[PDB]
Amino acid sequence: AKKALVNKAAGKPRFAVRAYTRCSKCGRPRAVYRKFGLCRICLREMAHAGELPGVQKSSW
Amino acid sequence: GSVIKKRRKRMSKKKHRKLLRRTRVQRRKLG
Amino acid sequence: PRKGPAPKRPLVNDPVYGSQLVTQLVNKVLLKGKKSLAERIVYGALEQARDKTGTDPVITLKRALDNVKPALEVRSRRVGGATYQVPVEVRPDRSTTLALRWLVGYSRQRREKTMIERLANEILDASNGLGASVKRREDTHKMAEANRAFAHYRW
Amino acid sequence: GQKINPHGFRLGITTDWKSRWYADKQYAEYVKEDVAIRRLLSSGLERAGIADVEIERTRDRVRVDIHTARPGIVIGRRGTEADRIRADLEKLTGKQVQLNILEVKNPESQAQLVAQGVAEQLSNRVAFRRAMRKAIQSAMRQPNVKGIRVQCSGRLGGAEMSRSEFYREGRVPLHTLRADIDYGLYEAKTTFGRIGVKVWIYKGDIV
Amino acid sequence: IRSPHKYKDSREHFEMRTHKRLIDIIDPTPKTVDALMRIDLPASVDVNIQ
RNA sequence: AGAAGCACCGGCCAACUACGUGCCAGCAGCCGCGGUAAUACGUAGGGUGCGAGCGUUGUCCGGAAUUACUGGGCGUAAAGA
RNA sequence: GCAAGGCUAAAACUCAAAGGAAUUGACGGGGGCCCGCACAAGCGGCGGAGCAUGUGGAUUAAUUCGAUGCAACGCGAAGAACCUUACCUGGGUUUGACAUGCACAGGACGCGUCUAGAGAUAGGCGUUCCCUUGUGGCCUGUGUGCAGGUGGUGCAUGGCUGUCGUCAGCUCGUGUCGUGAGAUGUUGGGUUAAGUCCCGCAACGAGCGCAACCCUUGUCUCAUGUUGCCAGCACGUAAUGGUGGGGACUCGUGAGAGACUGCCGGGGUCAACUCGGAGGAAGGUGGGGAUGACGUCAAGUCAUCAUGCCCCUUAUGUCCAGGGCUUCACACAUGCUACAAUGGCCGGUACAAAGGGCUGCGAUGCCGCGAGGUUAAGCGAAUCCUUAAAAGCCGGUCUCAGUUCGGAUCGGGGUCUGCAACUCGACCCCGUGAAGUCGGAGUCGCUAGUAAUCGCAGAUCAGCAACGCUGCGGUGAAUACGUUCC
Ligand SMILES: [Mg+2]
Ligand SMILES: [Mg+2]
Ligand SMILES: [Mg+2]
Ligand SMILES: [Mg+2]
Ligand SMILES: [Mg+2]
Ligand SMILES: [Mg+2]
Ligand SMILES: [Mg+2]
Ligand SMILES: [Mg+2]
Ligand SMILES: [Mg+2]
Ligand SMILES: [Mg+2]
Ligand SMILES: [Mg+2]
Ligand SMILES: [Mg+2]
Ligand SMILES: [Mg+2]
Ligand SMILES: [Mg+2]
Ligand SMILES: [Mg+2]
Ligand SMILES: [Mg+2]
Ligand SMILES: [Mg+2]
Ligand SMILES: [Mg+2]
Ligand SMILES: [Mg+2]
Ligand SMILES: [Mg+2]
Ligand SMILES: [Mg+2]
Numbered sequence A: 001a002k003k004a005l006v007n008k009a010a011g012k013p014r015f016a017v018r019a020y021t022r023c024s025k026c027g028r029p030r031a032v033y034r035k036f037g038l039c040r041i042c043l044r045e046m047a048h049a050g051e052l053p054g055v056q057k058s059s060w
Numbered sequence B: 001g002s003v004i005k006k007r008r009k010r011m012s013k014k015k016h017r018k019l020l021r022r023t024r025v026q027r028r029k030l031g
Numbered sequence C: 001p002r003k004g005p006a007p008k009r010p011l012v013n014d015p016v017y018g019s020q021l022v023t024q025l026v027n028k029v030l031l032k033g034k035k036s037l038a039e040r041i042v043y044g045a046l047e048q049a050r051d052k053t054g055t056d057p058v059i060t061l062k063r064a065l066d067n068v069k070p071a072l073e074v075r076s077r078r079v080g081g082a083t084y085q086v087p088v089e090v091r092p093d094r095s096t097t098l099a100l101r102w103l104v105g106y107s108r109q110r111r112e113k114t115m116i117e118r119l120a121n122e123i124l125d126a127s128n129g130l131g132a133s134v135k136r137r138e139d140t141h142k143m144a145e146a147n148r149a150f151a152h153y154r155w
Numbered sequence D: 001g002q003k004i005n006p007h008g009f010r011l012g013i014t015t016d017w018k019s020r021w022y023a024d025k026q027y028a029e030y031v032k033e034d035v036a037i038r039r040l041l042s043s044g045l046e047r048a049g050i051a052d053v054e055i056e057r058t059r060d061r062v063r064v065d066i067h068t069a070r071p072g073i074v075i076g077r078r079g080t081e082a083d084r085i086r087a088d089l090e091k092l093t094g095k096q097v098q099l100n101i102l103e104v105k106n107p108e109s110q111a112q113l114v115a116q117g118v119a120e121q122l123s124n125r126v127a128f129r130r131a132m133r134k135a136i137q138s139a140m141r142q143p144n145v146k147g148i149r150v151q152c153s154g155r156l157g158g159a160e161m162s163r164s165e166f167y168r169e170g171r172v173p174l175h176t177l178r179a180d181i182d183y184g185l186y187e188a189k190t191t192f193g194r195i196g197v198k199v200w201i202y203k204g205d206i207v
Numbered sequence E: 001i002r003s004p005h006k007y008k009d010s011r012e013h014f015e016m017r018t019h020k021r022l023i024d025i026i027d028p029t030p031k032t033v034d035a036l037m038r039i040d041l042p043a044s045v046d047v048n049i050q
Numbered sequence F: 001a002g003a004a005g006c007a008c009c010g011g012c013c014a015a016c017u018a019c020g021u022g023c024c025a026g027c028a029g030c031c032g033c034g035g036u037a038a039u040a041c042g043u044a045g046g047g048u049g050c051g052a053g054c055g056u057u058g059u060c061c062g063g064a065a066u067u068a069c070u071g072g073g074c075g076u077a078a079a080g081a
Numbered sequence G: 001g002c003a004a005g006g007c008u009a010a011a012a013c014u015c016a017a018a019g020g021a022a023u024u025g026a027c028g029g030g031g032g033c034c035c036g037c038a039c040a041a042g043c044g045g046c047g048g049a050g051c052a053u054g055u056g057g058a059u060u061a062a063u064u065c066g067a068u069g070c071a072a073c074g075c076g077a078a079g080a081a082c083c084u085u086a087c088c089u090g091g092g093u094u095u096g097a098c099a100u101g102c103a104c105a106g107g108a109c110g111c112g113u114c115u116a117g118a119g120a121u122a123g124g125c126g127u128u129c130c131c132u133u134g135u136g137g138c139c140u141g142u143g144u145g146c147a148g149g150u151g152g153u154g155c156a157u158g159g160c161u162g163u164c165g166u167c168a169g170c171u172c173g174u175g176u177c178g179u180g181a182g183a184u185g186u187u188g189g190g191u192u193a194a195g196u197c198c199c200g201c202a203a204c205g206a207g208c209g210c211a212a213c214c215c216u217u218g219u220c221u222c223a224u225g226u227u228g229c230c231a232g233c234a235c236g237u238a239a240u241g242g243u244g245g246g247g248a249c250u251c252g253u254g255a256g257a258g259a260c261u262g263c264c265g266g267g268g269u270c271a272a273c274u275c276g277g278a279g280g281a282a283g284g285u286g287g288g289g290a291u292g293a294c295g296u297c298a299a300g301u302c303a304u305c306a307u308g309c310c311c312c313u314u315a316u317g318u319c320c321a322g323g324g325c326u327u328c329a330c331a332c333a334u335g336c337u338a339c340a341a342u343g344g345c346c347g348g349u350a351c352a353a354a355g356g357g358c359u360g361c362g363a364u365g366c367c368g369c370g371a372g373g374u375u376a377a378g379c380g381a382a383u384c385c386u387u388a389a390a391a392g393c394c395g396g397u398c399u400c401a402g403u404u405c406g407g408a409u410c411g412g413g414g415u416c417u418g419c420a421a422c423u424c425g426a427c428c429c430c431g432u433g434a435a436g437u438c439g440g441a442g443u444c445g446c447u448a449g450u451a452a453u454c455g456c457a458g459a460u461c462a463g464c465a466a467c468g469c470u471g472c473g474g475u476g477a478a479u480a481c482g483u484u485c486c
């Protein structure tokens, strides 16, 4: 998103309820996971690149 | 599309005949 | 569909009654997946019936179904500037299913408290020839007979 | 687009994950610095022509494998730049690092390098209609290439309207799972914007 | 969601398999504890001692 | 030592980049340009063609085998009463 | 010429065309063959009610921006009380929250306290380890190139995506025909779900496509035995494989086998293939998924990210407190609950699958009607928790009523999270008990373990408007003669 906002998210805000998570790679504020710390698009392309382990597609 | 060439002539002739029928009397018979 | 007819589904013999029409009528009655409920309803209808019939209940239900079986329906078609209907013969497997579907539909709106004895008196009055589906039989029949004149369009 | 990643497909069928480790609780903060190390090694090092980067991490000892076109620049005067990137990696990860810049055994059949070569030449502003053809000729001189498809999209020479055209030869079955197809995509930088260069290279069914 | 914006009805599925095995060696010997400790495990495999 | 200017630079047609303007100003023979990145408008630089000349107009011929004697055509293109 | 009008026959003006043949497509209320829940036959719905949500509109100080037939509208947004936030009011600030280049100067910083809505401003403590010995580390102060921008342009763009459409087509090289655009190959007879294949032919071949290789489910063999299993023994305390114990079985998960028109009967040039059978768990592709050819829509995204140009620098940058993105005479869109007896309620009683758990799962016991509260065992999990699944069966009551339906609505009282619950969270108890009695024109989904119906789980997430989205399983249907019509 904005650099001031990614800095704010990386910092330690007061009133810990205020703390949230952004993308680890682009700073997207939405659709970000916790086990991945990584948003949906920047998880999709990373996993397609196979640069994060244990991930593939599925079919059941 | 050679019929188009006939349609243009048809329309021109039709309008001329319509004008003559509008004036087959002293509208045009005097002149 | 396009590639011929689709295969039908077999229906196994009933345990209570060595007959298939009970197994198929209960499935018609079935709604939302209460096979148990519909089955106890059908069985309760026949077992309530035998007291007022004396005859075997499936024999009575066959007597009813022979009454309410269609023969010739009124299937629609539009040809020119006006649509109309075509009298067409009904094959027996369609006819019985249509008849007992009418039975279920008009037993869902008949005037008693609950559907067990609703269907019960439906079965007995259809075996005696007086019911709502019974009168539908000979009104659909006469509607189709009044359009026999269009039977010469059989697709 | 409408084409999925062949790497995404054949990941676990034909090709392998770039990073192999195990974690349950600290995977998130391994990924956090994995993205950082890829930024680091992709920033300021484009001259070496990176091909790919492997990461291994096992109980507080990490191994960063790097395959590039030229192992010459990164090593420098017998370790003037390799140790420099090692130190700027140490101050980043807080962890002793076995960095291993190996090689790419041939930097002309390996996609993710064909794309950068074409892109750098586009930045040099010579004809992409010679670029793609010479990529074809350079990619049909290896013993093992049964097909290559090159696709470049963009303004492509100052055109006001973009366009995306591709050349190909041999067979490149992107719908075949038993097909070893290696994919590369690089963003050529030029005076009028950015040009997408994507290359698929087919190297046989499987060995 | 596949698209960066506006398309709900197109998705992708990504999954994780973690495979578990046990061995349960029985016979304890003092000279093999060090042997168990000195094992070059592969990179993606993790080992616990109970 | 007293003595050079004119026209043009998208194709015909020989001769190109930048800045100012942004369907406006405007250019133009033709087909077209300019609606935010103009080799086509204004300016600058460069260049080309000329040069005491260079351009615009008008007139005529040519290209026009588009009045055909040289040297044309008429089933469907204009053209068999 | 009776007339109708015919014959002869201009110019002004205006345009850069008008035309003729042929090619490729597209289209036709043209023809033929065919396919698709396209129709048809059914099942259940929406449009009616209330509510949730998005959108148009409106209003406001702002109601951020994008998405606008299908293919925008439970969409971006897989979680707006703060934050997110891009919006507004105000309090500040302004080499900045953040990154690097150039000059002069030496602790940055951390605890705790005061005021202030907070941002921050101030007392004062702790204070430069490192030869700030010019050299090392960092930092502020003063600047100076900047940083920054969710500011514009998706009609300058890359990347990603939708859509026709998982429709079976799209093409290419050599050769040939034609002045040429182009054509043939790719047409013709069969066949297939398929440009799938056989026979002919100025065609000969190849590629992207279809198919298969991949995953999941459906059977069997070998090894395997813990946290999984209990057939023959022993123990069984409270009978909870609890224990010793065993590889029988399940199950777990590794390797495999099997399905390939493989075999027989009939038809067909003996072809492609086709109908029917034997064996087989599965038969002609076993089912489902992943898969989106060339391209189309100047389709969407400059707001994931990157980005060519344009734009601000005491402001569009930036920090903080509030309010707004949740408003409301209306309109549309997608859903949940209903309008009951195939049901309401009471009680008893069975049968799962898939997932989650250390910032945690909370077994038992006790308190409270309940949400919940407390002690605390065990469990990073085939161990323990989640967990009792719910619909289902049995018995009793209710008896067609705006009800022993419906559960919106309101008052009162609360729990939990979160500094904080009014704007604007969820859950619980009592009383109150609306609209709604099956919804017009019109319109939607669905062909089998499907519709329908019932719960369970997850992502996001402290909490959650979770009825949204993605998954798991219980019960479980009726119809499809067929292509006239849409
Ligand atoms: Mg395929
Ligand atoms: Mg010239
Ligand atoms: Mg300009
Ligand atoms: Mg000019
Ligand atoms: Mg002149
Ligand atoms: Mg002449
Ligand atoms: Mg002239
Ligand atoms: Mg001539
Ligand atoms: Mg002649
Ligand atoms: Mg003529
Ligand atoms: Mg004649
Ligand atoms: Mg003509
Ligand atoms: Mg023609
Ligand atoms: Mg034609
Ligand atoms: Mg047609
Ligand atoms: Mg279907
Ligand atoms: Mg229908
Ligand atoms: Mg409504
Ligand atoms: Mg909006
Ligand atoms: Mg939806
Ligand atoms: Mg807010």
Ligand SMILES: [Mg+2]
Binding pocket: G154, G298
């Ligand atoms: Mg576009």
Ligand SMILES: [Mg+2]
Binding pocket: none
């Ligand atoms: Mg020729």
Ligand SMILES: [Mg+2]
Binding pocket: G186
């Ligand atoms: Mg063809």
Ligand SMILES: [Mg+2]
Binding pocket: G186
């Ligand atoms: Mg052709």
Ligand SMILES: [Mg+2]
Binding pocket: G195
């Ligand atoms: Mg083929």
Ligand SMILES: [Mg+2]
Binding pocket: G298
């Ligand atoms: Mg557009």
Ligand SMILES: [Mg+2]
Binding pocket: none
């Ligand atoms: Mg738009």
Ligand SMILES: [Mg+2]
Binding pocket: none
């Ligand atoms: Mg911008």
Ligand SMILES: [Mg+2]
Binding pocket: none
């Ligand atoms: Mg604020």
Ligand SMILES: [Mg+2]
Binding pocket: G325
């Ligand atoms: Mg909103």
Ligand SMILES: [Mg+2]
Binding pocket: G347, G348
């Ligand atoms: Mg009970």
Ligand SMILES: [Mg+2]
Binding pocket: none
């Ligand atoms: Mg109690």
Ligand SMILES: [Mg+2]
Binding pocket: none
């Ligand atoms: Mg009961």
Ligand SMILES: [Mg+2]
Binding pocket: G406, G407
């Ligand atoms: Mg109630």
Ligand SMILES: [Mg+2]
Binding pocket: G435, G436
């Ligand atoms: Mg009412």
Ligand SMILES: [Mg+2]
Binding pocket: G437
């Ligand atoms: Mg009623």
